[PDB]
Design a protein around this ligand. Structure first.
Ligand SMILES: OC[C@@H]1O[C@@H](O)[C@@H](O)[C@H](O)[C@@H]1O
Ligand SMILES: OC[C@@H]1O[C@@H](O)[C@@H](O)[C@H](O)[C@@H]1O
Ligand SMILES: OC[C@@H]1O[C@@H](O)[C@@H](O)[C@H](O)[C@@H]1O
Ligand SMILES: OC[C@@H]1O[C@@H](O)[C@@H](O)[C@H](O)[C@@H]1O
Length: 314
């Protein structure tokens, strides 16, 4: 290993945000602190000086952004309440207002978070699992945190993936979320502006490991068209990808890359098929220096490739 890699919690929560190829990756260190590594032409940071806050050991870690002007990172306190580490350009890092509400969730809850796409002002939807094992939406619409729509029951401790995009022929944002139900299937729920939440679950995978990591992204929004990619850790100790492509639907799935048993997963994307993209980046643990976080890359030039073998601080 390396001294730096040793500071990374084994099976750490992982989150990532980006403005095109300007990247931030969040993880938890062995002391419970949440740290930020970054890519700005090269990889840096992830050290004890790059701590944005503290969370319970083993906490989920979720993050979302508006470019890199506004970043929000969500974790659980020791008290199993949702908290928010917030960054705005010109202000820096601070404790976000979500913590004031002190929302208790299940101790084993995961978290997903999105800024809603294409809206006039900043709007956030956070998803977590309550002690009754239902998936609850929490909203920020500019005037305090409030519970939004309850999305019903899921496997206790389920992974939660989420994405928001705006169809260019609609006047409001769409949301897709993915999680695991008691039957061990992975499923999607969906919000569109003209329908609200659709009543049905859409199966994306028949049987997944219990509490497997789930991470999602979307890109290339157009007129009634979108592209999406969902990632999870399968029973073969590899990340699998499920593809939604416009005109083909959920048409393919397969292995991507090996991971450690019980690795967490994060995904970011940028660009689109129309402009020599997309670019995809996955972050996970595959045993590099034992506990380092590694990267997988997809791009138009070279397709599927391992990227940075060990993120900072490794
Ligand atoms: O533009 C983003 C960068 O793309 C490739 O160069 C990767 O090797 C690198 O780790 C980073 O993801
Ligand atoms: O624009 C986003 C910001 O970029 C750098 O300033 C980082 O040091 C900071 O933590 C944040 O990620
Ligand atoms: O614009 C988004 C908002 O930014 C700050 O006001 C936060 O305190 C709040 O929780 C939310 O994240
Ligand atoms: O626009 C997104 C939607 O915003 C509100 O209407 C929420 O009640 C709903 O669950 C969803 O998040």
């Amino acid at each position: 290993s390396t001294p730096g890699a040793q500071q990374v919690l084994f099976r750490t929560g992982i989150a990532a945000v980006n403005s095109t190829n300007h990247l931030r990756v969040y993880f938890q260190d062995v002391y419970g602190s949440i740290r930020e590594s970054l890519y700005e032409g090269s990889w840096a940071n992830g050290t004890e000086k790059n701590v944005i806050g503290n969370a319970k050991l083993g906490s989920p870690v979720a993050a979302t952004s508006k470019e890199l002007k506004h970043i929000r990172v969500y974790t659980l306190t020791e008290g199993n309440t949702l908290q928010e580490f917030a960054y705005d350009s010109g202000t820096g890092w601070y404790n976000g207002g979500l913590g004031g509400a002190k929302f208790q969730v299940a101790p084993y809850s995961c978290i997903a978070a999105v800024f809603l796409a294409g809206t006039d002002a900043l709007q956030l939807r956070i998803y977590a699992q309550k002690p009754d094992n239902t998936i609850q939406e929490y909203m920020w619409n500019g005037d305090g945190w409030k519970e939004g729509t309850n999305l019903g029951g899921a496997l206790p401790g389920t992974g939660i993936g989420a994405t928001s995009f705006r169809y260019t022929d609609y006047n409001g944002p769409s949301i897709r979320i993915w999680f695991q139900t008691d039957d061990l299937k992975l499923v999607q729920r969906a919000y569109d502006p003209h329908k609200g939440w659709y009543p049905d679950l859409v199966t994306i995978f028949d049987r997944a490991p219990p509490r497997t990591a789930i991470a999602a992204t979307s890109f290339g929004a157009g007129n009634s068209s979108i592209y999406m990619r969902i990632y999870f850790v399968n029973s073969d100790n590899t990340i699998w990808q499920v593809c939604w492509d416009h005109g083909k639907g959920y048409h393919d799935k397969g292995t991507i890359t090996p991971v450690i048993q019980g690795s967490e997963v994060a995904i970011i994307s940028w660009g689109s098929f129309a402009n020599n993209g997309p670019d995809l980046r996955l972050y996970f643990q595959n045993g590099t220096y034992i506990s380092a976080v590694s990267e997988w890359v997809w791009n138009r030039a070279h397709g599927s490739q391992l990227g940075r073998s060990a993120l900072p601080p490794a």
